[PDB]
Amino acid sequence: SKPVTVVYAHASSMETTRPASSASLSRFLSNLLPRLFLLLSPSQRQSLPFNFVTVDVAAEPRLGAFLALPSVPALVCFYRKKLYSVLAPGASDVALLRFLKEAADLSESRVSPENVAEAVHGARVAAWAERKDVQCLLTQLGVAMTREQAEEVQTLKNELVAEDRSEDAVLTGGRRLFAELQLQLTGDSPPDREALSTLLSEILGSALSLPESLQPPKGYAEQWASLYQIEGYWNELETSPVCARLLAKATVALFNHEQVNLQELDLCIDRASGEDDEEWPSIRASLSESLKTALNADEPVRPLDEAVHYAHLTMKNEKDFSSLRPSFFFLGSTAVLDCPLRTASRLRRLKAARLFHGGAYEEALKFAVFAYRLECQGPVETRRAAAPEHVLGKWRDEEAALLAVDSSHDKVGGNGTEDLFDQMACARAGWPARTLLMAMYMALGAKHPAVQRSRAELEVLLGTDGFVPVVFPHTRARAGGKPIMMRGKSGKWHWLGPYWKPPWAPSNKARWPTGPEEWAWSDPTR
Amino acid sequence: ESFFLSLCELEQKKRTERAIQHSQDLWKKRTAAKDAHSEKTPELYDGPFWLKFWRRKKRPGA
Amino acid sequence: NERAQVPDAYIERWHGEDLSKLSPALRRCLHLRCASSKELHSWRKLQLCRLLQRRPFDTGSPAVQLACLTEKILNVRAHLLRHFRDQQKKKVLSIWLSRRHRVMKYLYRVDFNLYKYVCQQLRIKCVRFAIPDSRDRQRAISPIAVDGDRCKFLIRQK
Amino acid sequence: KHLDHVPTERARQLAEQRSAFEPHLRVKLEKEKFLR
Amino acid sequence: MQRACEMVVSLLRVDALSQRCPFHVLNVQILDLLQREGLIRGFKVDGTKIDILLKHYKGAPVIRNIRVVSKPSRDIWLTPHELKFRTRFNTGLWIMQTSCGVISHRDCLRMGIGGKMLMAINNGY
Amino acid sequence: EKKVTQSLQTARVSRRKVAHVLWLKKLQDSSDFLQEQEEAARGVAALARA
Amino acid sequence: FSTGFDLKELLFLAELTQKSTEKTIPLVALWQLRNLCDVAYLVHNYTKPLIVLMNGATAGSGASLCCLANRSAAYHSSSFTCDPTAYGW
């Protein structure tokens, strides 16, 4: 069906005895429309670019209220069942032509400009413009289509916003950069890591958040005026959830690689159980050169929205000292492939990226929780259930469960370098196991069924569901002093005025139990 | 084949499912209330002023 | 003169997405040049906050609060220059100056590396809190002269 | 301090309710008998 | 330590059945000793505050006099041989804070360890 | 869990800003002189070039 | 009400006892059984009145703490269920 539908509203019922205005416009409109395209005959209703439909305002009360037209008659346009600009009555002849010209452009022969004067003048006996596409027209067409995820039609409009124009960059510049990212994330094959790094640098305005493996090659009124200059389109990622959603998509896809195999990867998952065994010669001596490379590749330790200008700052004097640091991440080397626990965790991440790109959403979240808990809870993860009454540290702990464990329980998880305890002290530290999991909740939203189900699962799997924080009130003392009125014949206040509520006053509900009256205003927005 | 060991497997598995469903419903209602509060005009106080609550009478003497 | 400068930017985060729906005539009104003092002052806070923003929609962190308080102190100081009979606000300025001093003490013990980085960007005289301050005024701390680099007429006297 | 584990009133109430699969608080009125 | 001295005002009431008290780790341990002697009917931690019941007998309450010895601004210490002189020919209850937990004055002399006088219950001059 | 609230905050502010755009559109429509001056401006532009 | 040594505890005592060829009863099995007899005899031989009320429903063999008491009581909100043959105990 035609996406553009022009609705012509008029009231000709009252003028059945004496036409005044309703019939005057019909005579001119019916004679001009056919000439500009070359109530109406059905044959000529199919060659038009928009659906011309007429409705009587003074015939149906339900429809009259929906449009809510202050005047009569007036032309109202529509596009994919959405309100558009409305042409008010009493306008000049130039205004009418303008409205029709834009109506036929949204749907996307026509009369050439050289023969426009004769068509309009000759149609008045019964009793296009040279401007190119409007800037707002293209922007309004791309904002709505991106939700549909087009493949071939999206590329065309992307190329028609920058060519031999170089005239509008403060308005259309924001959408141009984000439009290219969607196209790159639509192809079946994995996107190019190098291509994404260059594109994302401009949007964020800094390369510090990007991984080191994809970073680029290594007066008085002027000095103080450069402090408020921030390079980066942050406004697009704060007041537009649609725009901010695409940002999380790139983070998930960055964990993927190029030289990978689906069959090989699948087979290796089962073999490497990540137990106390230093991986058998069966697994260590069965890895190809392609897989080895992937494992060693860099990944974003922190999200893109965290530490965008101070990521390179060291964190040496932000740690805690403790001789007791038991962990499974100990094999005489910091290398990924030189650890059994780390090796298993890595494999999971690879498969998660492929599933998300293909379309599998529910299955993708399963691997993310698997890996996050693997390194957190230790090798003991096969037991897919709640903690077996082993949650220590609670008030009035039972002695039965204390004797059912040993030193094994004391071992803490974490990442290779840091641990759980280090993260508690330093708020800037992080590890990939958390960045990957956090990149998925925002990508699919917070109200998504699957996201909601996975969010609650983590609480029960970690054995901490039903936590109630305890916080005490704060002191009632505040700065300043009591109200004081200046003495003398000059009545004036010193610190505070009459409208001052002390910190020891009762609640407003008890002071005004009557509440607003029936005749009171329900909107104090004066 | 152990009869006592298998009993604990079912008890723990069933308990996990009950918590997951309960938590999901609790979070849904928790966020629903906050959304409504952040989409209404602030209520302007119009009750009696606090003119008598300024001065107080604490314990006399020491 | 510096406080009266109006850069080429927008208020209320009026990105080009929404501004495209308005007429060119109407867009002038929304520019910073046509904005008021309240809108102009608010814009400066947003730019500085993003420089030390840990996560989107987060202003309670000590890093953000340190920058926000700095802009508020200068805003009141500029007003006192034009208005000199407003003696009621003289007491309010002291409260903010002392409040900002306590923030530095707390941030110094929790994060030392970050405390130095924030001072360089804002050109604020970094001071360490490792020993108690003496009672002598000739060697004690002075919250008024914290921004010695930005202010050259409020350092010391005789 | 907010992460501390202290036994509150609402904390125990939620634990009992979680056991009941999708058994709530109930009250009883005074027994008024004319034969007494 | 300050919250400990705030319990005497609430527990020292005649026309009352139950009184609230701020929650504290040290306060919980004190109530246990008093209940053993039969001075408190019972108590319950209601979260941010603890609800403690009051015991009465023939109208008058079981507690008639409370004396606070230890204060946050200082610390009273007595040797095993000095506590006996202080506490003699009396039925009072003195809370002693020893290294091995909290015990009454009667048990402190039995072990012979140097305790700390916190408060007095049913004490005269 | 903090990341979950980030998405909700963006949606909440987005709805508030949407209502603001509607108010400004009313002014434009309701304004007569704005349209009249704008209309005139455009006409002269093409005549000078032609 | 008091369920009286629920079936969950008895399951562990059965498999452990029958695991060995000699069927030697472990110490834990007899320790719990003997304790049940001590409490049952004390309530019956109480030297002072023992008032008890069954406010809840009784399932299985769990009425020993009310029937053997010196002064037993009941009310409308009470029940008596005892089906040992179903559980084979």
Side-chain angles (χ1 to χ4, degrees), chain C residues 13-73:
Chain C
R13 304 163 179 162
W14 272 123
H15 55 184
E17 186 186 321
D18 291 352
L19 293 172
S20 184
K21 311 186 185 181
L22 266 57
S23 70
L26 217 69
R27 293 180 181 177
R28 299 220 297 279
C29 305
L30 268 73
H31 207 252
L32 261 166
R33 283 192 283 276
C34 208
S36 71
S37 184
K38 275 283 191 174
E39 295 166 315
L40 176 59
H41 182 225
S42 178
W43 179 85
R44 286 169 177 161
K45 281 194 190 171
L46 181 59
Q47 300 295 92
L48 271 165
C49 170
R50 288 173 175 166
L51 187 66
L52 308 167
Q53 183 183 74
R54 207 213 309 282
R55 287 183 289 92
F57 302 95
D58 162 51
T59 55
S61 62
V64 171
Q65 287 191 113
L66 207 78
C68 292
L69 282 158
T70 313
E71 202 72 50
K72 244 168 166 172
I73 291 157

Side-chain angles (χ1 to χ4, degrees), chain A residues 302-343:
Chain A
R302 270 191 298 276
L304 309 196
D305 294 330
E306 306 196 348
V308 75
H309 279 124
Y310 45 88
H312 68 280
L313 185 61
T314 61
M315 308 186 291
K316 187 164 280 191
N317 307 313
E318 212 192 348
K319 295 173 170 275
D320 48 5
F321 317 101
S322 52
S323 58
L324 264 288
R325 292 176 179 279
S327 64
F328 311 98
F329 312 91
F330 191 77
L331 213 77
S333 183
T334 66
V336 183
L337 195 69
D338 297 342
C339 176
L341 196 57
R342 286 200 292 279
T343 310

Side-chain angles (χ1 to χ4, degrees), chain A residues 401-473:
Chain A
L402 295 173
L403 308 183
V405 301
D406 209 10
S407 304
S408 321
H409 200 274
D410 293 346
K411 305 188 174 172
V412 78
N415 77 295
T417 308
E418 301 97 48
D419 310 310
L420 273 79
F421 301 131
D422 209 330
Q423 300 282 315
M424 199 207 299
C426 164
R428 297 180 282 150
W431 59 328
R434 203 174 66 207
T435 311
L436 178 57
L437 181 59
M438 281 165 69
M440 293 177 70
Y441 291 3
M442 195 156 186
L444 285 161
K447 291 185 180 177
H448 193 269
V451 176
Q452 286 185 343
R453 188 178 172 79
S454 185
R455 195 211 69 77
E457 191 168 310
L458 197 77
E459 297 187 59
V460 194
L461 260 56
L462 296 170
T464 173
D465 174 70
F467 189 75
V468 176
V470 181
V471 66
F472 303 101

Side-chain angles (χ1 to χ4, degrees), chain A residues 51 94 113 179 234 238 253 277 280 285 296 302 346 358-359 364 437 454:
Chain A
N51 203 345
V94 70
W234 292 113
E238 285 192 326
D277 58 337
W280 284 302
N296 283 292
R302 270 191 298 276
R346 236 292 177 175
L437 181 59
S454 185

Side-chain angles (χ1 to χ4, degrees), chain A residues 29 105 108 110 135 161 229 256-257 344 360 365 403 413 468 496:
Chain A
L29 190 70
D105 295 348
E108 294 192 11
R110 274 189 290 280
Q135 298 279 5
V161 290
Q229 289 174 335
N256 214 333
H257 218 249
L365 294 167
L403 308 183
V468 176
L496 274 154

Side-chain angles (χ1 to χ4, degrees), chain F residues 15-50:
Chain F
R15 286 188 294 281
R16 181 170 278 189
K17 206 189 197 197
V18 170
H20 196 189
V21 191
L22 267 73
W23 181 74
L24 279 88
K25 284 177 174 183
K26 295 179 181 180
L27 308 171
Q28 195 186 295
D29 285 13
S30 192
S31 281
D32 304 308
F33 194 76
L34 271 159
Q35 305 188 76
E36 189 182 335
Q37 271 277 298
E38 288 180 23
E39 189 166 313
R42 292 184 185 86
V44 297
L47 187 67
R49 290 185 171 164

